């Protein structure tokens, strides 16, 4: 019974008023009642607890006495020391209470029946100005629906609730700590999101629309109720399509993630019933674009496949190059000490012999090595499921041959963001030929439309005339031959590239505002020699800057690299796999790496050795420190470029010849959504990759996909353009600056309620434009210009050579009239003065909360 519908006929409105919260509330309660949700009147936690007692007793076939009920309540159901995370843990992991009754007998008390989902009781209650419907599961408040007036903007509604994170609890409301899901609606638009204490997942960007399997949205509250709020749909979303990970983050899956998972599950059942196993028609493949949640989804799909009573083993297979701190932490819980960068199979052989267990997490490298050496494994004759998460190739081809030869009853599935088509299978087997049919898809154009993945701002930094010919070279033989100190690794090119990165790092990563946290960056390079050259030049130029200024704030730079198997004899599209056996590297490489590791150790007070165990532990710690921004810039060759998840990484500096799938995978390191401060990922290249970018985008889309994936120009954001995909006109920053000065020249004078509303709407566009434009070198150069003031013999230029601007460009730039930095702060404080205060409609008005919050709070020193 698919819960992400193939087809759905839109419901028709009742001729009754549908404008106020009460109107939305009445129809919500009515449709839910029509859909099997008993409406009950509760006006206290005492009445809520009495109802929980009835449901839990009913569900478990037990009757508590008052003493036993009070004891269950205080020790398991509503412990006063329990927070939201404890309740999430109780719903998703510890949902069974081993309860000892007064007669000393043991009873297993379930909060939810997860095997027979429809056995659970579902009820609805209403608020006891804050119009809310709550869905109760066995009396527990698991879903809360916020209803707002039709005119109110859903983003401001959501912002008003997250305004103050002072979510305090008491003995009269502590049952609400059990909430798993929130739904915010205004009638026309309806968005859902997880109840999580993790502020890094609490922005509007993580709110989701319900949808159909073709990924078309279900925005209308009435249609949302008729689909998402069906008992069978909601209970599956809460119990099976919600993840509570090792970091104690609750994640509710998006419709596309649910659509792919149930279609894989259905296909295993189908192929088993029809005895049609061990064929490409037994499994299938999923095309979910890079960064859309493939690693989240496939692992959950694997875990749900273990629940199929007829299945014996479920292999969840990842490429070791995609491993990072968070995924390694997660896999450690299921397959201890067996998912790492080594070639060892001992862990895999041990996990396979574990009884009362079906999940096997391993790498494609370890699975290949096992199938090579072993031929008498009992697993080969068992009913086995394979879930491959982006297992690229190199090792996958060999792995497929032994798999088809040794495994007798299997269903294999693959998840990929960049499939192998014939047009890029000139030295590989296609996704379709390996796996069979495309079970579900969620393409980059769908992800961008949904704001579930960010766009790319891609630019070649053409500011080195001496080296342009090398940097614009298209011949493969010439590019590989130019990997030396006379060509690409020339001290002056490396000094020029590094000096640009040091001067523009803070601009690119939004660290320019004083109290602003900002983002961090990565630098992907051509070779181990390039990695060496850059790390050295960064250290040199940074040591030089610390001498010339005691006010200098250095950046924490790190590097990691190993030996690439096919660096000489390969292609150009696939990023070369690096071994975890450091003893394969040349003496100077190993020497340089140890020197960098010792500097890392001294700074972070760590003791990572040079050996295999040492490097593996260094890889893990490095991944975590780049993700939490302990490291400002990570220098890499081919590592942390295909699976590394870092939502606060926004800039990728590139001095490498990236092509097709490798280009998409690498650029996508910056594509994670965060909040309004992260508008897109910056791609700054020192080799011309404009053609390679368009070729890569077009391969996993069409001729138009580049207009959606790539960000617009500086002139366009300064003067205005019309988005082709949305059909709407976006006002240019200069148009907004002009209107701000004409309509509101105010020294503090402001005006009426109509002017205040008009200003908030205007300055909101300003903040959104200024923040988007921070990512533009042209805008940075323009903003830097507003600083000088001199007369007769004194200090001049410097700006020209640092911004690579001639005397002609510098002449016209002075004519550009921008508002004074104090007037912007006057507008920023005038805007903040209208923060809340408590005619003219303030309904459709949205404040830039995330963009504002980049203020000057407790940075003091």
Ligand X SMILES: Nc1ncnc2c1ncn2[C@@H]1O[C@H](COP(=O)(O)OP(=O)(O)OP(=O)(O)O)[C@@H](O)[C@H]1O
Beta strands in 55-159 (DSSP E): 96-100, 106-110, 122-126, 132-137, 140-147
Question: Which CB atom, from 457 or from 627, has the smaller least distance to ligand X?
Answer: 627
- Determine the Cα–Cα distance for residues 146 and 130; give it in Å rounded to an integer: 8
* Candidate residues 295, 335, 340, 368; the one interacting with ligand X per rule CB under 6 A: 295
- Determine the Cα–Cα distance for residues 471 and 264; give it in Å rounded to an integer: 45
Q: Residue 105's binding partner, choosing from a second copy, ligand X, Mg ion, none, with beta-carbon cut-off 5 to 8 A by kind?
A: a second copy
Q: Minimal distance in Å, beta carbon 351 to ligand X?
A: 23
Question: Which CB atom, from 315 or from 717, has the smaller least distance to a second copy?
Answer: 315
Q: Minimal distance in Å, beta carbon 381 to a second copy?
A: 25
* Candidate residues 292, 351, 431, 582; the one interacting with ligand X per rule CB under 6 A: 292
Residue-wise DSSP of 513-581: STT----EEEEEESSHHHHHHHHHHHHHHHHHHHHS-TT-----EEEE---BTTSSSS-SSSPPPB-S-
- Contact between 100 and 75 under an 8 Å Cβ cutoff? The reply is no
- Determine the Cα–Cα distance for residues 9 and 217; give it in Å rounded to an integer: 13
Q: Which range of residues in 247-255, 399-407, 704-712, 729-737 is near ligand X by CB under 6 A?
A: 247-255
Question: Which CB atom, from 297 or from 693, has the smaller least distance to ligand X?
Answer: 297
Is 92 annotated in a binding site? The answer is no
Residues of this chain, 797-816, that bind Mg ion according to CB under 5 A: none
Residues of this chain, 201-240, that bind ligand X according to CB under 6 A: 206
Q: Residue 215's binding partner, choosing from a second copy, ligand X, Mg ion, none, with beta-carbon cut-off 5 to 8 A by kind?
A: none
Per CB under 6 A, does 417 bind ligand X?
yes
- Determine the Cα–Cα distance for residues 260 and 435; give it in Å rounded to an integer: 14
- Determine the Cα–Cα distance for residues 467 and 475; give it in Å rounded to an integer: 16
Residues of this chain, 292-311, that bind Mg ion according to CB under 5 A: 294-295
Q: Which range of residues in 150-158, 293-301, 687-695, 698-706 is near ligand X by CB under 6 A?
A: 293-301
Q: Residue 524's binding partner, choosing from Mg ion, a second copy, ligand X, none, with beta-carbon cut-off 5 to 8 A by kind?
A: none
Task: Look up tokens 């409105």; give the residue.
Answer: 13
Question: Which CB atom, from 107 or from 630, has the smaller least distance to a second copy?
Answer: 107
Binding characters for ligand X, 644-683, by CB under 6 A (x = yes): -x-x--------------------x---x-----------
Q: Residue 206's binding partner, choosing from Mg ion, ligand X, a second copy, none, with beta-carbon cut-off 5 to 8 A by kind?
A: ligand X
- Determine the Cα–Cα distance for residues 9 and 227; give it in Å rounded to an integer: 10
Question: Which CB atom, from 299 or from 563, has the smaller least distance to ligand X?
Answer: 299
Q: Residue 192 gets which letter from DSSP?
A: E
- Determine the Cα–Cα distance for residues 2 and 6; give it in Å rounded to an integer: 8
Tokens for 434?
């390996």
* Candidate residues 139, 283, 284, 291; the one interacting with ligand X per rule CB under 6 A: 291
Residue-wise DSSP of 45-79: HHHHHHHHHHHHHHHHT----HHHHHHHIIIIIS-
Q: Residue 53's binding partner, choosing from Mg ion, ligand X, a second copy, none, with beta-carbon cut-off 5 to 8 A by kind?
A: none
Q: Which range of residues in 160-168, 294-302, 465-473, 757-765 is near ligand X by CB under 6 A?
A: 294-302
Is 295 annotated in a binding site? The answer is yes
Residues of this chain, 390-409, that bind ligand X according to CB under 6 A: 390
Contact positions vs a second copy (CB under 8 A): 67-68, 71, 100-106, 337-338, 342, 344-347, 350, 609, 611-614
Q: Strands across the sheet with 633-636, in order?
A: 456-460, 681-685, 649-655, 520-525, 633-636, 557-560
Is 279 annotated in a binding site? The answer is no
Is 293 annotated in a binding site? The answer is yes
Residue-wise DSSP of 399-430: HHHHHHHH-SEEEEEEEESS---GGG-TTS--
Tell the burial category of 4 from Cβ atoms under 10 Å away from its Cβ (0-12, 13-18, 19+).
buried
- Contact between 310 and 383 under an 8 Å Cβ cutoff? The reply is yes
User: What are the phi and psi torsion angles at 840 (to 5°)?
Assistant: 70, 130
Binding characters for ligand X, 332-361, by CB under 6 A (x = yes): ------------------------------
162: CB partners within 8 A, 6+ apart:
202, 849
Question: Which CB atom, from 252 or from 530, has the smaller least distance to ligand X?
Answer: 252
Per rule CB under 5 A, count of chain residues that contact Mg ion:
3
Is 289 annotated in a binding site? The answer is yes
Q: Which residues does the annotation place in the binding site for ATP?
A: 288-295
Binding residues for ligand X (CB under 6 A): 206, 251-254, 257, 290-296, 322, 390, 417, 643, 645, 647, 668, 672
């Amino acid at each position: 019974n698919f819960i992400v519908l193939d087809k759905y006929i839109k419901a028709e409105p009742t001729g009754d008023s549908y404008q106020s919260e009460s109107d939305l509330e009445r129809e919500l309660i009515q449709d839910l009642r029509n859909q099997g949700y008993e409406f009950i009147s509760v006006k206290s936690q005492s009445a809520m607890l009495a109802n929980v007692r009835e449901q839990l007793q009913n569900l478990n076939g037990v009757v508590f006495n008052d003493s036993e009920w009070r004891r269950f309540t205080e020790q398991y159901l509503d412990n006063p020391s329990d927070g939201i995370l404890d309740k999430t843990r109780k719903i998703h992991i510890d949902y069974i209470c081993d309860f000892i009754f007064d007669d000393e007998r043991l009873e297993n008390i379930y909060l939810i029946d997860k095997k027979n989902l429809m056995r659970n009781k579902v009820q609805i209650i209403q608020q006891f100005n804050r119009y809310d419907v709550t869905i109760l599961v066995n009396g527990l408040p698991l879903v809360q629906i916020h209803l707002k007036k039709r005119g109110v903007a859903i983003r401001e509604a959501f912002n008003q609730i997250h305004r103050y994170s002072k979510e305090s609890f008491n003995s009269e409301n502590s049952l609400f700590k059990y909430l798993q899901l929130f739904v915010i609606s205004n009638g026309t638009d309806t968005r859902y999101f997880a109840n999580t204490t993790k502020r890094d997942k609490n922005s509007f960007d993580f709110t989701m629309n319900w949808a159909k399997s073709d990924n078309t949205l279900i925005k209308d509250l009435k249609d949302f109720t008729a689909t998402c709020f069906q008992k069978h749909t909601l209970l599956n979303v809460l119990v099976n399509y919600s993840v509570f990970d090792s970091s104690q983050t609750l994640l509710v899956m998006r419709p596309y993630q649910i659509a792919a998972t149930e279609r894989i599950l259905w296909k295993i059942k189908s192929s088993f019933t029809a005895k049609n196993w061990s064929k490409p028609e037994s499994g299938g493949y999923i095309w979910h674009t890079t960064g859309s949640g493939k690693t989240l989804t496939s692992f959950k799909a694997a875990r749900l496949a273990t629940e199929l009573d007829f299945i014996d083993k479920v292999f969840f297979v990842v490429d070791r190059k995609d491993l990072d701190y968070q995924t390694m932490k997660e896999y450690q819980r299921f397959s201890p000490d067996s998912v790492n960068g080594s070639e060892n199979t001992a862990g895999l052989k041990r996990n396979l012999d574990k009884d009362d267990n079906k999940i096997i997490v391993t790498t494609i490298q370890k699975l290949n090595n096992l199938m090579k050496a072993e031929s008498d494994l009992p697993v080969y004759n068992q009913q086995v499921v394979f879930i491959f998460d982006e297992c690229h190739r190199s090792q996958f081809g060999e792995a497929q041959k032994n798999l088809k030869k040794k495994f007798k009853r299997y269903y294999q599935f693959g998840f990929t963001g960049t499939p192998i088509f014939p047009e890029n299978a000139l030295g590989s087997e296609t996704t379709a030929s390996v796996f069979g049919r495309e079970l579900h898809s969620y393409v980059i154009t769908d992800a961008i439309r949904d704001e579930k993945v960010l766009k790319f701002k891609v630019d070649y930094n053409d500011v080195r005339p001496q080296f342009k010919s090398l940097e614009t070279e298209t011949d493969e033989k010439k590019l590989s031959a130019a990997e030396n100190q006379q060509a690409f690794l020339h001290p002056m090119r490396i000094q020029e590239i590094t000096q640009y990165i040091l001067n523009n790092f803070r601009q690119k990563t939004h660290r320019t505002f004083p109290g602003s946290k900002g983002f961090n960056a990565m630098l992907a390079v051509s070779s181990v020699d390039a990695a060496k050259a850059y790390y050295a030049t960064f250290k040199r130029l940074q040591e030089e800057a610390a001498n010339k200024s005691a006010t200098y704030k250095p950046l924490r730079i790190a590097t990691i690299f190993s030996f690439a198997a096919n660096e000489e004899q390969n292609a150009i599209g696939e990023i070369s796999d690096e071994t975890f056996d450091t003893s394969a590297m040349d003496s100077s490489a190993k020497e340089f790496l140890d020197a960098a590791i010792r500097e890392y150790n001294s700074h972070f007070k760590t003791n990572f050795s040079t050996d295999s165990n040492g490097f593996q532990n260094y890889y893990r710690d490095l991944a975590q420190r780049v993700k939490n921004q302990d490291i400002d810039l990570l220098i890499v060759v081919g590592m942390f470029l295909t699976g590394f998840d870092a939502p606060t990484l926004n800039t990728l500096f590139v001095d490498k010849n990236l092509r097709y799938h490798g280009l998409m995978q690498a650029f996508s390191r910056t594509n994670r959504i965060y909040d309004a401060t992260k508008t897109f990922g910056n791609i700054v290249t020192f080799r011309d990759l404009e053609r390679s970018t368009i070729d890569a985008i077009t391969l996993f889309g069409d001729k138009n996909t580049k207009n959606v994936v790539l960000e617009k120009s500086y002139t366009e954001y300064m003067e205005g353009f019309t988005d082709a995909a949305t059909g709407e006109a976006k006002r240019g920053f200069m148009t907004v600056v002009s209107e701000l000065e004409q309509r509101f020249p105010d020294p503090t004078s402001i005006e009426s309620e109509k002017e205040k509303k008009d200003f908030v709407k205007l300055f909101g566009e300003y903040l959104r434009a200024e923040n988007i434009l921070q990512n533009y070198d042209e805008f940075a150069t323009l903003k830097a210009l507003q600083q000088i003031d001199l007369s007769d013999p004194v200090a001049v230029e410097k700006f020209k050579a640092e911004h690579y601007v001639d005397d002609e460009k510098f002449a016209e730039l002075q004519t550009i009239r921008l508002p004074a930095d104090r007037k912007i702060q006057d507008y920023r404080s005038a805007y903040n003065d209208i923060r809340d205060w408590q005619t003219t409609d303030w309904d459709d008005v949205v404040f830039e909360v995330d963009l504002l919050k980049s203020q000057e709070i407790n940075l003091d020193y």
